[PDB]
Amino acid sequence: GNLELALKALQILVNAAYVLAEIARDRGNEELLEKAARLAEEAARQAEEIARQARKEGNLELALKALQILVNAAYVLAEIARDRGNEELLEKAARLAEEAARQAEEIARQARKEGNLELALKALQILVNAAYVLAEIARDRGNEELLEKAARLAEEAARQAEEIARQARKEGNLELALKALQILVNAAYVLAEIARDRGNEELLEKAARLAEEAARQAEEIARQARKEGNLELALKALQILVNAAYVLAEIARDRGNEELLEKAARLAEEAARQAEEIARQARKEGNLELALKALQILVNAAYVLAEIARDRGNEELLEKAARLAEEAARQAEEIARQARKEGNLELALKALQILVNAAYVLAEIARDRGNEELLEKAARLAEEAARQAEEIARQARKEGNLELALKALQILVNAAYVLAEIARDRGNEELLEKAARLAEEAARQAEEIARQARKEGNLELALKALQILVNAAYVLAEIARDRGNEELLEKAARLAEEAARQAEEIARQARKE
């Protein structure tokens, strides 16, 4: 009776259904769409059963993980339904999302009574996630009543998160305060998305106040944590500053406010400058994991700046974003190299992941600029990561370290995704086919590892392998997308149905246990 392991399997089931739904749409295959809906519905049916058992036993953490699957299932059912006019599916999706929101609010109440503020914020994140799914459904159906309910759910989450941040400060617990600020940012993003259903100016202004409230406090918390020498805390705060700036840019973009656009960009640049200084300090002290966390903020800040620059081809911001991403790529390469010399292969893989993420941001900038050399530089970064990933995977499997191997295969899938996107940017069939083969190799090794894991009875390991299958199948679907590649869509559908079927078997065994 391993409920945590069963839920992990069901999340894989939802993720596979989501991928099959995307493949079914690209190919107009109504039968495949029906199959994806049943998988998503079956995942939600079992998750809702597990939610009930978890709460009966008082395991609120497990119950929240079950509610998240309800929400993800609802999202998948709404994505399937909106193309056609499938009101019966949208109603099921709304029912699931509303049930998740209700239970989330009940658990937030109970968590706060018992003084468990971290649990309460996890309940509020589910509340925000359910509000997001409801907002999409309500926008599809032109149901203003339900849009109003989604907005009220997001606002309730932000209101409670504001209260918990104040309690957290009073207990000196700034880490917890930051988790509350992240709820504010996520709630603000949902409200702005709801307000973008034509001129709800009062909702947009509410969303902007929330995001600005989080930015202001994240910036001050980062400054103080850094002055007190608490670098790990400062970076968490800088991530929230970047996330707040992203939402402010979306609000600014929508409301045509060039002033707010510029403010959002300054916040993102300030976060990147602080992260750059923290990375240099962390490497001076020899703290490579810290340093890599700083570099990912550089990439995230650069991604925000490039998005801000999108519409109007802003020359300063695009070149600023380019230098930030290249800075992170170079330092990640250096750290990967040192980590591999010191035999620290997990650290090396984290560095390659930052390299892939930097390369993705550079490819976006190169694309918008028609910059051939930067596109080529981005592809070389992605190809460097993929090559090092398969070397680490090969050695990991040789020594029987399957978890390490799977982490390396995930890097390979991510690098293939970046290379696929560059291949789109050049209209190059050859590069596109090379990216697909990188993804196919990763999927092939992941299937064999899943088989070896299950033969040994290691179901936790096998589920991690199945997730790579899902992610690989998603990359293959993105490559065949808008190209009419029937051969590739079939390989993608095959991988996602493989993961789905094995996830179902593992869920069943975990529930017996």
Author numbering: 1 to 513
In the authors' words:
Circular tandem repeat proteins (‘cTRPs’) are de novo designed protein scaffolds (in this and prior studies, based on antiparallel two-helix bundles) that contain repeated protein sequences and structural motifs and form closed circular structures. While these cTRP constructs have many favorable properties, we have previously noted that their ability to self-assemble from smaller subunits is compromised by relatively limited contacts and small surface areas that are involved in packing between repeats and subunits.
The crystal structure of the tcTRP9 particle, determined to 2.1 Å resolution, validated the accuracy of the design. Superposition of the design model and the experimental crystal structure produced an rmsd value for all alpha-carbons of ~0.5 Å, and close agreement between side-chain rotamers within the inter- and intrahelical repeats and interaction surfaces. The only positions where the side-chain rotameric conformation significantly differs between the design and the structure is for a pair of leucine residues (L11 and L37), which interact with one another through van der Waals interactions between their side chains in both models. Repeats from tcTRP9 and tcTRP24 are shown with darker shades and lighter shades, respectively. a Alignment of the sequences of an individual repeats from each of the two designs.
